[PDB]
């Protein structure tokens, strides 16, 4: 809806603090761990799929973080 596209990387930032800062600066990192801690099966399955695709460990951890981040 309108609550998405949240006006973050638009430039226009000064040292005056913004509208909802230190409240929306960590909300994605809190809903992503609420979502992990209430859906463990997709995190495990994304660890198997992330461990399968990827030779080196860095791209395995990258595919794990990105696959865990695309799902809400």
């Amino acid at each position: 809806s309108v609550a998405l596209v949240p006006h973050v990387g638009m430039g226009l930032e000064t040292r005056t603090e913004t509208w909802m800062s230190s409240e929306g600066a960590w909300k994605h990192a809190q809903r992503i761990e609420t979502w992990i801690l209430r859906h463990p099966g997709f995190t495990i399955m994304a660890a198997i799929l992330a461990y399968t695709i990827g030779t080196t460990h860095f791209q395995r951890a990258l595919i794990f973080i990105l696959l865990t981040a695309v799902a809400p």
């Binding site: 309108v2 973050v8 638009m10 226009l12 000064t14 509208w19 909802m20 990258l62």
Partner: protein, 495 residues
């Protein structure tokens, strides 16, 4: 003097040939200007006003639906149409239902259906726009006159207000004593309006990006408008319900106020209930200080007998402010202020309130100076009653260099190339480094745009990691200029 205890101060030292220094003053900060034999001044922008706005586009926050009509046809007999579908204040949808003999129809198939409902707004959100013309800035000019009730005092007649408008941006300030001062401000190359929209909800207001404003999914209407009868994207705030392939319906989606307050994250709040008073952004100023006298040269020295009426009181950014009273004779006179040490006395410590004078003997005078990073002794009187005071200062040795580096790196992380306009005409170094910052700013821009707190840190570690593994000494590039700079910026994002 209007500047003390604000925690974003940015001292400016020096002047360049013909006596002008190039500064950039912001709404949070207040810049202190120090020259060689010229009084030290204190500047702050305090008010940015957009004088007359023209509304660009009106969205609706909440609406209502009346006059619900529905029209269905047979399976093979085409598709329904009633005259509320051509009327552009009704919202409409074609769906398809089950028909048979129980519906009085025949042929037993799926027949089309339409539902229309009259759209009526009842809460608005007006996005106004202004041109860079008639955008008026207000800067107060407060000198370091040692004078009672002055230090953090943001009221009264301690300063002089000047008004930078982009058609006439010179407007010299004649203040009483100390001569005059002119400022060549460049307000067009600042915040860059024509691409920013003064959005306005009921009792609040924001300052949002213009292309951000023109692609919000919400029913809009042009600005120059009188009747609410041509809302364009009405389907973004209604919904059509067709369960079971029986009849369908339409309902309103609800008040979009708090969802828009989640959209307005990152936008800087302004206020436009009375005026259009912005309180964000910077202004580049060229400070020409030629006709700037000192107000108290060719006075004689004091005879002595000072007394302290308010104590030393160290400020953040490591300066001290004492307030002293004078009793004696010959009342227009110069305070014998020094910051010495003990025996075989050296001069260690700079004076900020330069040439402190006594005027109106029965009234205090508050002097500002800075010590070095250890023991230091303040001396005020001269032969009898020499007012020697101890003072100790913590840190301020190498940590002052890293605090200066973090002020320059934060000041370079907030401002763009304009952060290079904080010094007085470096010639080839400031111009070449600023030009490289415009190239790196234009390539770092049109990239990292729409990219948040987290994604810059992720995209910085996955370019630092491929920097450390690369060869041919590209490691000294992909770590330095794009690897840890984007990590640092990604920490400083969402100011």
């Amino acid at each position: 003097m209007r500047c003390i205890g604000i925690s974003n101060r940015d001292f400016v030292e020096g002047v360049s040939g013909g006596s002008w220094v190039d500064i950039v003053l912001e709404h949070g900060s207040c810049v202190t200007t120090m020259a060689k034999n010229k009084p030290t001044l204190d500047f702050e922008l305090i008010e940015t006003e957009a004088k007359q706005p023209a509304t660009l586009r009106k969205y609706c926050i909440e609406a209502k639906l009346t006059n619900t009509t529905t029209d269905s046809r047979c399976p093979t007999q085409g598709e329904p149409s009633l005259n509320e579908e051509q009327d552009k204040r009704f919202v409409c949808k074609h769906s398809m239902v089950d028909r048979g003999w129980g519906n009085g129809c025949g042929l037993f198939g799926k027949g089309g259906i339409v539902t229309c409902a009259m759209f009526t707004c009842k809460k608005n959100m007006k996005g106004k726009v202004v041109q860079p013309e008639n955008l008026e800035y207000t800067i107060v000019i407060t000198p370091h006159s040692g004078e009672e009730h002055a230090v953090g005092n943001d009221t009264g007649k301690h300063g002089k207000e000047i008004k930078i408008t982009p058609q006439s941006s010179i407007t010299e300030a004649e203040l009483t004593g100390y001569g005059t001062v002119t400022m060549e401000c460049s307000p067009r190359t600042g915040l860059d309006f024509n691409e920013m929209v003064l959005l306005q909800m009921e009792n609040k207001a924001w300052l949002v990006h213009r292309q951000w404003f023109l692609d919000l999914p919400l029913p809009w209407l042009p600005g120059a408008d009188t009747q609410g009868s041509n809302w364009i994207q009405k389907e973004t705030l209604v919904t059509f319900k067709n369960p079971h392939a029986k009849k369908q319906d339409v309902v309103v989606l609800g008040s979009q106020e708090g969802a828009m307050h989640t959209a307005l994250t990152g936008a800087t709040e302004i206020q436009m209930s009375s005026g259009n008073l912005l309180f964000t952004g910077h202004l580049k100023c060229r400070l020409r200080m030629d006709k700037l006298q000192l107000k108290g040269m060719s006075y004689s020295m004091c005879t002595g007998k000072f007394k302290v009426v308010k104590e030393i009181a160290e400020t953040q950014h490591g300066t001290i402010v004492i307030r002293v009273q004078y009793e004696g004779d010959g009342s227009p006179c110069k305070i014998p202020f020094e910051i010495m040490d003990l025996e075989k006395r050296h001069v260690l410590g700079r004076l900020i309130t330069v040439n402190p004078i006594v005027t109106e003997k029965d009234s205090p005078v508050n002097i500002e100076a800075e010590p070095p990073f250890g023991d230091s002794y303040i001396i005020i009187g001269v032969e009898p009653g020499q007012l020697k005071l101890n003072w100790f200062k913590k840190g301020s040795s190498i940590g002052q260099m890293i605090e200066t580096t973090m002020r320059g790196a934060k000041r370079m992380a907030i401002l763009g190339d304009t952060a290079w306009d904080f010094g007085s005409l470096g010639g080839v170094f400031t111009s070449i480094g600023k030009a490289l910052h415009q190239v790196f700013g234009a390539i770092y821009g049109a990239a990292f745009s729409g990219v948040s707190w987290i994604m810059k840190i992720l995209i910085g570690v996955i370019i630092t990691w491929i920097g450390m593994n690369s060869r041919s000494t590209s490691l000294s590039v992909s770590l330095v200029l794009v690897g840890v700079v984007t990590l640092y910026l990604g920490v400083m994002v969402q100011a």
